[PDB]
Amino acid sequence: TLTYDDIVGTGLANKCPTLDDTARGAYPIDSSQTYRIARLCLQPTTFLVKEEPKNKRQEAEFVPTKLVTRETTSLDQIQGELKVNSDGSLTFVEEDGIDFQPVTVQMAGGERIPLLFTVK
Amino acid sequence: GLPWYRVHTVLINDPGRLIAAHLMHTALVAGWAGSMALYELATFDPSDPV
Numbered sequence: 001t002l003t004y005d006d007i008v009g010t011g012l013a014n015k016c017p018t019l020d021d022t023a024r025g026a027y028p029i030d031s032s033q034t035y036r037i038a039r040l041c042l043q044p045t046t047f048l049v050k051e052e053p054k055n056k057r058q059e060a061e062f063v064p065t066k067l068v069t070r071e072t073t074s075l076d077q078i079q080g081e082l083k084v085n086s087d088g089s090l091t092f093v094e095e096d097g098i099d100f101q102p103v104t105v106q107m108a109g110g111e112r113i114p115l116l117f118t119v120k
Numbered sequence: 121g122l123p124w125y126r127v128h129t130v131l132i133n134d135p136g137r138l139i140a141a142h143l144m145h146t147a148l149v150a151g152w153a154g155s156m157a158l159y160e161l162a163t164f165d166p167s168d169p170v
């Protein structure tokens with residue numbers, strides 16, 4: 001574990017935790033025991049912006065873009081119940097947390113494309 | 121003295137100022153190139169090569 005000071009300024013604070021190469025197991029679900037997600041976390045790696053095919057509809061694709069703001073992208077502290085369903089499936093239901101971050105990326109042209117990257 | 125259309129003959133044999141002159145010209149032609157570029161970059165649209 002590292003204290004605040006052990007992270008401050010490294011940018012490490014905007015990174016969801018990681019599991020080692022080992023941890024490739026399996027977790028059990030009691031289906032008779034409620035479960036919740038104590039901490040969901042999402043870290044962006046890429047932001048692609050589908051381009052408008054001009055008038056000539058020719059099918060448009062997504063293109064990479066430069067992150068003009070900085071390392072403020074990550075969503076963290078997400079939480080909610082992970083109810084088990086009758087058919088034995090699982091559906092997560094978020095309640096609260098840093099569930100959104102305003103991001104801004106530039107493009108080929110120089111156009112800044114702001115988005116409210118979220119999962120509310 | 122000199123007619124207007126002859127003022128540059130003042131260099132016919134002053135290798136020094138002839139080079140000084142030729143240097144200034146190159147400067148303007150190079151200068152033009154640089155800035156004609158910027159003008160196109162400030163107005164050219166890459167949005168569609170087709």
Ligand code: CLA
Nearest residue numbers: 122123124125126127128129130131132133141142145149
């Ligand atoms: C390629 C290089 C070149 C060079 C180094 C010269 C050099 C010279 N020429 Mg000459 N000339 C050239 C091409 C060239 N010429 C061509 C292609 C033509 C046919 C149009 C002529 C026709 C010509 C005539 C009829 C005469 C000269 C004369 C002279 C001498 C003039 C002295 C002076 O004070 O200029 C004076 C120049 C001015 C006062 C200003 C001219 C302003 C107007 C017409 C143009 C402005 C142009 C613009 C700013 C940029 C032009 C860019 C260009 C690429 C088109 C000088 C040594 C004179 C001479 O022999 O004197 C003893 C003379 O009577 N030239």
Ligand code: CLA
Nearest residue numbers: 122124126127128129130131137140141142143144145148
């Ligand atoms: C492109 C290169 C060029 C070069 C190297 C020269 C070089 C020279 N010129 Mg020319 N000249 C040019 C272009 C050029 N001229 C043009 C286009 C014109 C208009 C016709 C003239 C008209 C001219 C005259 C009438 C005389 C000379 C003279 C002389 C000599 C002057 C010595 C001196 O004390 O400077 C002083 C003289 C100058 C610096 C030339 C004037 C330059 C002015 C016209 C323009 C400056 C450009 C401006 C700030 C930017 C443009 C912006 C745009 C939006 C309009 C020198 C060897 C003199 C001479 O024969 O001496 C023995 C002289 O009497 N020149």
Ligand code: CLA
Nearest residue numbers: 134135136137138139140141142143144145146147148150
């Ligand atoms: C022995 C080698 C030699 C070399 C390599 C050159 C080379 C050159 N001469 Mg030349 N010259 C020589 C001998 C030589 N000369 C002799 C014995 C005479 C009789 C006196 C002349 C008389 C002469 C005249 C009258 C003129 C030239 C010009 C030019 C230039 C034309 C192209 C240009 O300006 O583009 C531009 C490309 C560049 C600026 C990049 C060059 C980068 C390096 C090579 C040089 C950086 C500058 C350096 C400190 C000084 C250069 C000295 C030069 C002799 C190499 C060119 C750099 C013309 C000129 O000066 O036009 C403006 C011109 O009018 N020369």
Ligand code: CLA
Nearest residue numbers: 125127128129141144145146147148149150151152153156
């Ligand atoms: C590739 C070849 C090339 C050649 C051979 C020349 C040759 C010449 N240039 Mg240059 N030039 C070139 C490329 C070239 N240029 C490029 C790429 C640029 C950047 C755009 C310039 C920019 C430039 C400037 C800014 C000036 C020259 C000038 C000159 C002349 C200097 C010597 C002189 O006194 O002539 C005697 C001058 C003449 C014989 C003029 C006749 C020009 C003919 C060819 C066309 C006339 C058409 C029309 C009246 C011009 C419209 C002008 C507009 C303002 C309304 C010479 C004839 C100088 C000049 O013209 O001084 C008077 C000058 O000031 N040039």
Ligand SMILES: CC1=C(/C=C/C(C)=C/C=C/C(C)=C/C=C/C=C(C)/C=C/C=C(C)/C=C/C2=C(C)CCCC2(C)C)C(C)(C)CCC1
Nearest residue numbers: 144145146147148149150151152153154155156157158159
């Ligand atoms: C000094 C210096 C510097 C800077 C520089 C600069 C900034 C420059 C600029 C330059 C420029 C900015 C230039 C420009 C030029 C231009 C030109 C050269 C033009 C020309 C024109 C013409 C010639 C025209 C004509 C015509 C007309 C009008 C019409 C009809 C046709 C014709 C075409 C004839 C530096 C920092 C590097 C360092 C060292 C020092």
Ligand SMILES: [Ca+2]
Nearest residue numbers: 051052107111
């Ligand atoms: Ca666009």
